Amino acid sequence: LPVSMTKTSVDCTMYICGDSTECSNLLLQYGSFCTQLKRALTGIAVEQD
Amino acid sequence: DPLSETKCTLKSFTVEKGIYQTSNFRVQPTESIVRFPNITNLCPFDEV
Amino acid sequence: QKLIANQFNSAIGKIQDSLSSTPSALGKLQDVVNHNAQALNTLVKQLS
Amino acid sequence: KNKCVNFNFNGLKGTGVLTESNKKFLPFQQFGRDIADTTDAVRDPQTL
Numbered sequence: 001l002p003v004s005m006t007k008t009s010v011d012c013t014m015y016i017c018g019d020s021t022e023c024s025n026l027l028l029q030y031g032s033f034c035t036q037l038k039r040a041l042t043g044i045a046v047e048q049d
Numbered sequence: 050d051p052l053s054e055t056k057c058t059l060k061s062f063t064v065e066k067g068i069y070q071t072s073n074f075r076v077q078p079t080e081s082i083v084r085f086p087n088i089t090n091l092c093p094f095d096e097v
Numbered sequence: 098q099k100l101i102a103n104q105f106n107s108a109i110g111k112i113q114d115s116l117s118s119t120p121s122a123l124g125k126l127q128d129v130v131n132h133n134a135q136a137l138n139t140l141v142k143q144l145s
Numbered sequence: 146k147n148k149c150v151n152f153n154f155n156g157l158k159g160t161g162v163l164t165e166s167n168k169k170f171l172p173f174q175q176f177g178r179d180i181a182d183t184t185d186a187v188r189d190p191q192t193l
């Protein structure tokens with residue numbers, strides 16, 4: 001019987017943009033998705049434990 | 050301050066006991082370099 | 098008592114041997130690992 | 146070498162650290178691509 005899956009995490013700006021910086025400046029106006037992703041992934045990670 | 054950063058992240062003046070993910074760190078570049086082929090021949094634009 | 102003890106020991110030995118010699122016995126955990134790894138690889142591939 | 150810098154080789158500009166590499170490039174080969182199709186190994190215009 002499987003019990004828990006691997007706890008994963010993602011970095012928003014590192015993936016969505018690259019090594020550039022004004023790309024993040026453009027990103028800042030698209031919304032607050034990063035909060036949603038961090039909250040959901042943290043919930044999954046704590047649910048595993 | 051990191052406590053102030055946590056307060057800003059939670060959007061509250063008081064934070065309960067625990068661990069919170071605030072932001073990300075990354076070391077900034079120190080200097081800059083540039084490399085180009087070793088050419089010193091001007092292109093023929095006057096002749097065109 | 099002795100017959101049941103012998104049967105139990107033989108059963109344990111057969112379980113060890115069967116688990117050793119069966120490739121598909123542990124399929125579920127390997128499937129979980131494969132699912133996670135493949136999803137992550139697909140994510141990193143879609144960037145291109 | 147071994148310092149976080151923002152470089153540009155022949156108009157290909159990017160931020161990172163440049164290290165000595167042991168990849169066996171073919172004489173005609175110039176670039177190096179990873180799984181995500183981002184440049185990983187480069188050949189400088191000078192000193193080859």
Ligand SMILES: *[C@@H]1O[C@H](CO)[C@@H](O)[C@H](O)[C@H]1NC(C)=O
Pocket residue numbers: 087190191192193
């Ligand atoms: C020009 O560049 C080539 C290739 O890197 C090198 O062999 C040569 O010595 C260079 N010449 C000068 C004057 O820097």
